[PDB]
């Protein structure tokens, strides 16, 4: 149905954001070091 | 690998296969995460998988031999990998995609010597892992004396001596060889590396006599291997539990030697033939063959530590077919794990795992609780108490997490001043079932983790710290916040270098002393903090994750700071600290904006005492100030009662439902995640819109203050015009508010999120802006 | 990219047949050691690569 | 003590009728009870001696049942050198033949142990696994056990979706979830966990909401939740029957709420006998629903599901549960050959919905036609029932 | 339903890109920090 897809979108927004944030934190650590 | 290692590896494999569509790289990541056996233990069709692999293997015999060598080396996930490989070779499309992608990526781009080397490597590993911990050094003469080796030493012309006399000479020879002394006719000779002593028999003997002698001799060669293996494995660097295994092997060798002495006495009595001798030896011969097989399985890859304990459990399971083998496996597992399992019980019961052999399941690494307090990562949580899934037994593999958790909990209680030693800890001995050891470890964890939680709550006063944080960072104590605002009104508003941080600290201290926050026992723990960047700029940068041109002021940088002391420093991190500091800075900015609006309206009251017909320009300014103040007050009330308050209530309730460190962390994280989700801290455009609205309000307040100052003396862009500039600032602030409302409504429509609907209702209570929002939606 | 164990896993896969790129072989080894089903890993990899 | 008295199906050494399944055992279903002890030896001859025939094929199926029961009970006595001419055992299996004494002592004890293992597994699955709690909460919410919820719906809640707010609006997730929570709260019977767990599933998205034919509101489908691995005996038939029962209840509730809205619109301020026609139409539906479960069938259906779990294998327990569910559905005469009866009922319900709209407005012709068609279709259905049973 | 499925696929692609960059950054960290 659509409820599973809506929950997937809500989780996936945070999933893409978290992957990007982890990449950004790794980039900041790499630039510092 | 990393915390996002699943997604990282999934996307790396998707790019390696050059397949970002189809199912998708995140689809493969979700397939792996959702469809995932908790461990590589499920059984597979060994014969069927071997045939399937052999259909496309460069050498099926090589595949089988590789599996055997991997078993010797204690390689993990080999049979499951074989099943997956057979399935993938059946999957020609997946195999073809992987092969083409790999092509594209490539185009783009003696026994004594071995024993000495093994002892040296074990010593090297023990030195690298011991941090200078000294280990016993055996006199090298023991390993350097081949005459001291216990294996088989590693004749009359048989055509001339009588068959009976030749048989008697060979019997003495075999008694010597099986007792470690090369016989006259049959002598077991040196083994090249890990092997048994090779028996070479005189070729002129009687056919059947020599055949039966060799048939008995299989046990002799196996025992020559076992004695050499016991001497080699007796090195201390191989492991203390390895030392226990070597001692058990030596005791078994001693029992076999007693049997061989009885055999020599019977040879003195003359009560056998070669075949009868083999028949009598058959039981001990089978035991020695099994022991040699087990020793090969262990030492071929040097299974030591919990890898050797998992091998022992697997051996007990493989010996379940033969009851004597299963019972001996359980008993010897108990005997061997007594050192290792006692260390594991010490690790789980006392929070300290001691193994100079480095055979402890729960490990410890250098960590700083002060760093845990100041940095987002928990150094004490991760490095100071690590979990190594290489010294965890197979019977303890599932409970490795719980055992290491009990050890870390005991260590945390010790850092909390409670000497960690589990009173329900049990001596751990490996048997066919570690289920009882699992239950004991669970009780030890429920003791140690509870002790750490109790120390953090009572001894460390985590609840008191939470109350102080609510009073300072969230401004739960309004008197202290008002006093700080009053004292730092002219100090924080000064620039970064124009506002003395010492003056800021003094004003905050005066606010705490002269406010109701002095009632908090930890009210003095709060201090003034300066952000490295603007709060809105930081919010935008963090959302966009993957100061000479921006005005800097002490009011912008003003915030609360808190220091964490272990084990509370091991609990409080800098990610939550950064979120709380951002919230505190935002709250301070909102309070300053509300105070400015109230001050603007108060000076706007001069028209009430003045003639009402000489305030035409100020009427619009006063109306705009009142409207902005009312909208800000309604928005602030709604936000305070719905966003931050739900986070605090969730934190309190879930920590009340938290029993362990993990439960408390989950409670606090749920509260923090609810706060972050409800605060709309993901849109830099929203942060910019809020900053624009606050700037419009500030410009209107500045214009009104300039007009009031000019009127009192008579008795930039905002100050240039009285009412036209006020109208433009009101229009800009209303546009920013409408954009924020539209973004909130979109979020409510997409994410069931009622916060935007509540905000719209709060701003459109009287319908002054309800119609405007509805019209702007179209 | 591929560590000693990851390269060993890739060499074992090639000995059983098939070329696993050092990144792909390391990822497959990680998925197997990630407490996951090797058959599920194969299914996900097929859905990604073949699809 | 390893594979019967330890009920294991982990055989890769070609010596059992049981082959361990990496997926059937984990996904405890009919697939679990089938191939958890996959046919490593499809004939259990290669699995054991001829003296194990009492539970030989039983052992082959028992490995698979143990895999199905693994997610709740995998380990138990149920689930996962010869001498000289010593005449004792020689005569024991010779004077009385080997299989004779073997079946007398071992295979008889083997059958007793297998029966005890099956009974213990069934009792563990049926005692407090919340699987039957799933069915109870489905009958409480998917079938509205509390009359308060239905009354509140037909009085105030059945306003928007009863006629259809919009194809997109009536399918709003947040509004629908709030409505479900409010319907559960209005009744102190829809508070069951599976009452709120009644979820949304669909086959066709909303397309139209014209209140002329009986299409008032039939989009939402109630789907309660059960425990795992209670789905070992899960076949598609029982779930499909439950969903169909929920859909039929939803359609009947839509008709009743249309009638209630008609009455409310009439009372808010050429229409005679409308209430009489509504009662005449509703009498047979109420009779059928009571026959399905009112106070006696309300316990008979429970007793049938009380015997749904009495098998030594998950497939047979599934068959018993599905038979009880099918008998409950057949109580309402849900035969698939009754598609023409469905068409006749659809015409009657379209007329009923049109008459409800007309009565809400202020039809008299619709009511008279409803009474006449009620009599005529009653005669036709009586003839059909006489011809069928 | 289908629009939400398409959004799920798009978010899967977004996580794919971000986590592939994350794996590349882990490679860079293994090359630099060691």
TrEMBL record, chain A:
Protein name: CDK5 regulatory subunit-associated protein 2
Domain of life: Eukaryota
Shown segment, full-protein numbering: 59 to 91 of 1663
Lineage of producing organism: Eukaryota, Metazoa, Chordata, Craniata, Vertebrata
Compartment(s) where it occurs, according to its Swiss-Prot or TrEMBL record: Cytoplasm, Cytoskeleton, Microtubule organizing center, Centrosome; Golgi apparatus
UniProtKB/TrEMBL annotation, chain B:
Top-level taxon of origin: Eukaryota
Keywords: Cytoplasm, Cytoskeleton, Microtubule
Any single biological process term in GO: microtubule nucleation
GO molecular function, one term: gamma-tubulin binding
Subunit structure, as described in the record: Component of the gamma-tubulin ring complex (gTuRC) consisting of TUBGCP2, TUBGCP3, TUBGCP4, TUBGCP5 and TUBGCP6 and gamma-tubulin TUBG1 or TUBG2. TUBGCP2, TUBGCP3, TUBGCP4, TUBGCP5 and TUBGCP6 assemble in a 5:5:2:1:1 stoichiometry; each is associated with a gamma-tubulin, thereby arranging 14 gamma-tubulins in a helical manner. Gamma-tubulin at the first position is blocked by TUBGCP3 at the last position, allowing 13 protafilaments to grow into a microtubule.
Gamma tubulin complex component C-terminal domain residues: 462-769
Protein name: Gamma-tubulin complex component
Gamma tubulin complex component protein N-terminal domain segment(s): 171-459
Gene it is expressed from: TUBGCP2
Automatic annotation (TrEMBL), chain C:
Subcellular localization: Cytoplasm, Cytoskeleton, Microtubule organizing center, Centrosome; Cytoplasm, Cytoskeleton, Spindle
Sequence similarity: Belongs to the MOZART2 family.
Protein name: Mitotic-spindle organizing protein 2A isoform X4
Naturally occurring in which organism (per UniProt): Sus scrofa
Residues of the full protein shown: 30 to 80 of 155
TrEMBL record, chain D:
Localization annotation: Cytoplasm, Cytoskeleton, Microtubule organizing center, Centrosome
Domain Gamma tubulin complex component C-terminal: from-to ranges: 131-389
Top-level taxon: Eukaryota
Family: Belongs to the TUBGCP family.
Function: Component of the gamma-tubulin ring complex (gTuRC) which mediates microtubule nucleation. The gTuRC regulates the minus-end nucleation of alpha-beta tubulin heterodimers that grow into microtubule protafilaments, a critical step in centrosome duplication and spindle formation.
Assembly and oligomerization: Component of the gamma-tubulin ring complex (gTuRC) consisting of TUBGCP2, TUBGCP3, TUBGCP4, TUBGCP5 and TUBGCP6 and gamma-tubulin TUBG1 or TUBG2. TUBGCP2, TUBGCP3, TUBGCP4, TUBGCP5 and TUBGCP6 assemble in a 5:5:2:1:1 stoichiometry; each is associated with a gamma-tubulin, thereby arranging 14 gamma-tubulins in a helical manner. Gamma-tubulin at the first position is blocked by TUBGCP3 at the last position, allowing 13 protafilaments to grow into a microtubule.
Protein name (database record): Gamma-tubulin complex component 6
Native species: Sus scrofa
Taxonomic lineage of the native organism: Eukaryota, Metazoa, Chordata, Craniata, Vertebrata
